[PDB]
Design a protein around this ligand. Structure first.
Ligand code: GCP
Lengths: 136, 133, 23, 313, 95, 37, 126
RNA sequence: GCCCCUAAGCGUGUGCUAAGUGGAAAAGGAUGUGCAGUCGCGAAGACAACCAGGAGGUUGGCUUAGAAGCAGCCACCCUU
């Protein structure tokens, strides 16, 4: 499942949520795509889930792209512990997704089935997202 | 109006002939008896009989040439039809004999128009899978 | 949880102008 | 969910007797990114954290899991209604492991079940309807892998399989032609049906034998195991082959409850014989004429419906 | 069809652009071979209308306040959430 | 009557309707009939 | 309705009536395909017995040049374009009033003109 | 803040709401309702319904005794 090979610093602050996306805000690989509309931390798990959803929906066709890689690590203190004595170990790899960013992109000869698979992916994702298209 | 397609042979076979004649009306035998009596001379050709029934009963002795697809089969040179028409064609049946034999059968079915008959027979050949030239 | 929800939502009034002490 | 719960319970209960020592040793450095033993799902995903970390949490979760399996037993027996309500013969593919059970199922039924290279590939017993030589829309189910010295710490997983084998009639015993002691393989895997019947005693079901991997197996075995050895039939290859008499002897050894007493079907309605033709097979359709006379088998209700009309030939 | 009116910008800046975009007048800047930048405004409705059919590249007859002038669409700064053009950059053409 | 926050026509014959301020799906097949509730 | 059909609707009657010295119009309803063909195709030797839209052909009639029979199109119409021969055509149209009785001649265009209540029978009673 | 409790508007003009929404809440579901756009059709007759046909080839070919259009699979044309 998606994961960085290595990261320079293992314990980083949480990725910021403020502001809109000034980059990655257009379909530039495939024909359709999922444009988010709400700040969130999309995680390796959700990305894998949506990818499997789209691939299972489209039968051995089309090409899929992911314009976001989970690289920011989020820690977690071990259970049943007081507050203090250092940050927790890395727990979840998250990609800071911002309003307007295109998360998934698809290119499939058909139209209805591409739309349907994209809807599947959106449902699997946490955030509110719409289906944008290369046309405009 | 019940049509049974059959040749001039045979006599009361249930799986192909268990019709309303045996269900309700005259005995089962008389139907085929009176049907084959006036058309024994068929020799394998299919001569379907279309019987009518009135408020109580009214036998009718009616006939017709074999199906269009079956005539195509007879002339083509095969006994079994192809289950994959336009995927594996068997024979390229020509049009001269088709015309000479359909110049009256289609005049009875719909009309004697040679072009219309040609288009209909082309459709039937396409259906069977043994198309024409 | 009802008491907390209510005390917090009390901040959305025309008189507090949106902020309440100890929200 | 069934697997992710029952395997989780088995793991918790295996920890139970050794919650002290090595479990703490594992948790000490934790997985360290990823450990050599995951959790409820093992292959990443859920179960990423650990198995046993606190005795309280472990006990709590074993309780919850036991309740969950209580729920799943009801769900499973509800699902398994139609077959028991219909009295439809069922057969079970009983193989030790990697004996190509799923592949054999794909064969003979056109099924498309997964067939992966591993000693434990098929997770839950899956089944499909099949046809015998003449009909009998019977049922065929696989079994989950059984390895020597069946770990009793993991029975909740094989409990469903055990039920599905004890609620069946004819058993077909698949072996794998890899090891040198297939006799040991078969005896070992058969040691389990003994306790299966001990618990859920109904009867010793009729038995049949088969061994997959024919193409690659017996490379130096020759047909000794095919002639001298007792009951066994095998043509499947390590990828798939043709099936010749596995589907004939399977029908001849399955329950023959279907009565074969001759019945007389008259003409009567326009297609009254259609009922018998579609129900009870049409074996020996000695069609004659008019009120066609024939000889075919029929089930209990059709036999009782035609009783009065059963005039001797 | 390709004839789009225009109106020079009375003011310019954050407030002027915001007010214009609220009233539905996409701002634009016209410059190029003539080498004399002009800040103007167009009706976003007709601008998008012509853009739908003629595509991003197109030779637009910009009817300026006082005369006409040919132009070419160079840039379209568009908001990614609200799919609406925020600013247009037109390249004059000398023919 | 499946009470579910998510009601969608399961089959081509299923028709949605608003009744007593409460969305309900009704079909010729009784099994598909459901309500939002 | 359809634009192409409308466009052809001129020629759909123009040459037909230009050639046919006579044509019939009547409220047709009931005769199956077989009954209709019994005279349309089964007896096709000197007249094309067809039908056409009675609402779209009202303008097409004016276009073709006929104007006497325009108020009689308000309802089903069964046209019979003959190439002139009337002694057999009148008999053909009068034959159906024994077996079906569902086929009368409400009117039509005789010799580029209209007709009366008795002309329907007097076209050719010989 | 201005119906009475309670000092002061049951204020005036446009609209909106049927939910007591106002007078708590998410993913998601949704033939509720106002408005601004678009694409088909339609006064040469459409959208609903009503009167007749909806045919011949032909039980179209594979399958099946069977499959006539209706378990299922290929073709899926024309005569008027
Ligand atoms: N012996 C045999 N092996 C096969 C056959 N078809 C595929 N295989 C190979 O065997 C491997 C294991 O699959 P399989 O033996 O079917 O699994 P199984 O024995 O049915 C169930 P489990 O693996 O849990 O014991 C697969 O990787 C496949 O490539 C076959 O017909 N016979």
């Amino acid at each position: 499942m998606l994961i960085p090979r290595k990261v320079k610093h293992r314990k980083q602050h949480h990725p910021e949520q403020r502001g809109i996306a000034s980059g990655g805000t257009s379909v530039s690989f495939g024909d359709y795509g999922i444009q988010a509309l709400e700040h969130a931390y999309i995680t390796n798990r959700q990305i894998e889930s949506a990818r499997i959803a789209i691939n299972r929906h489209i039968k051995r066709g089309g090409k899929v792209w992911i314009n976001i890689f989970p690289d920011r690590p989020l820690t977690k203190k071990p259970a049943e512990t007081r507050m203090g004595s250092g940050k927790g170990s890395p727990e979840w790899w998250v990609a800071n997704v911002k309003p307007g960013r295109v998360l998934f992109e698809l290119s499939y000869p058909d139209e209805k089935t591409a739309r349907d698979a994209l809807t599947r992916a959106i449902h699997k994702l946490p955030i509110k997202a719409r289906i944008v298209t290369r046309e405009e | 109006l019940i049509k049974l397609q059959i040749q001039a042979g045979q006599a009361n076979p249930a799986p192909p002939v268990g019709p309303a004649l045996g269900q309700h009306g005259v005995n089962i035998m008389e139907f085929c008896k009176a049907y084959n009596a006036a058309t024994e001379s068929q020799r394998g050709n299919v001569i379907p009989v279309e019987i009518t029934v009135y408020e109580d009963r009214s036998f009718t002795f009616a006939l017709k040439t074999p199906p269009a697809a079956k005539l195509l089969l007879k002339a083509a040179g095969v006994q079994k039809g192809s289950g994959e028409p336009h995927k594996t064609k068997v024979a390229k049946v020509t049009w001269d004999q088709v015309r000479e034999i359909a110049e009256t059968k289609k005049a009875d079915l719909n009309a004697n128009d040679i072009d219309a008959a040609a288009k209909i027979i082309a459709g039937t050949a396409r259906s069977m899978g043994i198309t024409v030239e | 949880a009802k008491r907390g929800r209510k005390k917090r939502d009390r901040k959305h009034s025309k008189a507090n102008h949106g902020k309440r002490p100890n929200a | 969910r069934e697997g992710k719960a029952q395997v989780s319970l088995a793991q918790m209960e295996y920890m139970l007797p050794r919650l002290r020592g090595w479990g703490e040793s594992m948790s000490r450095q934790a997985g360290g990114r990823a450990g050599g033993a995951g959790g409820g799902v093992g292959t990443r995903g859920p179960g990423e954290t650990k198995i046993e970390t606190d005795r309280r949490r472990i006990r709590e979760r074993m309780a919850k899991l036991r309740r969950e399996i209580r729920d799943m037993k009801k769900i499973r027996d509800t699902q398994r209604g139609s077959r028991r309500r219909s009295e439809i013969p069922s057969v079970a593919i009983v193989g030790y492991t990697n004996a190509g059970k799923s592949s054999l199922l794909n064969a003979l039924t056109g099924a498309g079940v997964l067939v992966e290279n591993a000693l434990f590939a098929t997770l839950e017993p899956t089944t499909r309807r099949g046809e015998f030589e003449d009909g009998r829309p019977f049922v065929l189910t696989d079994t989950v892998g059984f390895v020597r010295h069946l770990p009793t710490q993991l029975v909740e997983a094989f409990r469903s399989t055990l039920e599905e084998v004890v609620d069946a009639d004819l058993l077909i015993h698949v072996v794998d032609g890899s090891d040198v002691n297939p006799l040991a393989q078969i005896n070992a895997v058969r040691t389990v049906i003994n306790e299966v019947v001990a618990e859920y005693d109904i009867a010793p079901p009729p038995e049949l034998l088969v061994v997959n991997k024919i193409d690659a197996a017996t490379g130096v075995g020759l047909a000794q195991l095919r002639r001298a050895l007792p009951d066994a039939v095998f043509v499947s290859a390590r990828t798939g082959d043709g099936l010749d008499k596995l589907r004939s002897r399977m029908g001849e050894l399955v329950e023959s409850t279907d009565a074969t007493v001759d019945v007389t079907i008259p003409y009567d309605r326009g297609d009254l014989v259609a009922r018998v033709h579609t129900d009870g097979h049409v074996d020996a359709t000695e069609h004659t004429d008019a009120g066609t006379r024939i000889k075919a088998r029929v089930p209990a209700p059709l036999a009782a419906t035609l009783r009065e009309y059963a005039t001797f030939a | 069809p390709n004839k789009l009116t225009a109106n020079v910008r009375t003011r310019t800046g954050k407030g002027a652009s915001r007010q214009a975009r609220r009233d539905g007048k996409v701002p634009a800047v016209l410059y190029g071979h003539g080498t004399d930048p002009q800040h103007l405004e167009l009706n976003a409705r007709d601008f998008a209308a012509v853009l739908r059919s003629h595509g991003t590249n197109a030779i637009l007859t910009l009817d300026i306040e006082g005369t006409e002038q040919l132009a070419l669409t160079k840039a379209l700064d568009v908001h990614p959430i609200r799919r609406n053009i925020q600013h247009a950059d037109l390249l004059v053409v000398q023919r | 009557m499946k009470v579910n926050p998510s009601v969608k026509p399961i089959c081509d014959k299923c028709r949605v309707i608003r009744r007593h301020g409460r969305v309900m799906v009704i079909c010729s097949d009784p099994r598909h009939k459901q309500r939002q509730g | 309705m359809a634009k192409a059909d409308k466009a052809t609707a001129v020629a759909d009657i123009a040459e037909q009536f230009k050639a046919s010295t006579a044509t019939v119009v009547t409220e047709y309803r009931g005769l199956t395909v077989a009954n209709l063909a019994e005279l349309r195709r089964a007896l096709g030797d000197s007249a094309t017995y067809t039908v056409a839209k009675n609402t779209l052909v009202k303008r097409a009639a004016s276009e073709a040049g006929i104007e006497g029979l325009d108020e009689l199109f308000a309802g089903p119409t069964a046209i019979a374009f003959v190439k002139g021969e009337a002694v057999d055509a009148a008999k053909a149209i009068k034959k159906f009033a024994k077996d079906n009785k569902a086929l009368v001649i409400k009117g039509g265009y005789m010799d580029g003109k209209a007709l009366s209540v008795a002309d329907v029978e007097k076209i050719a009673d010989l």
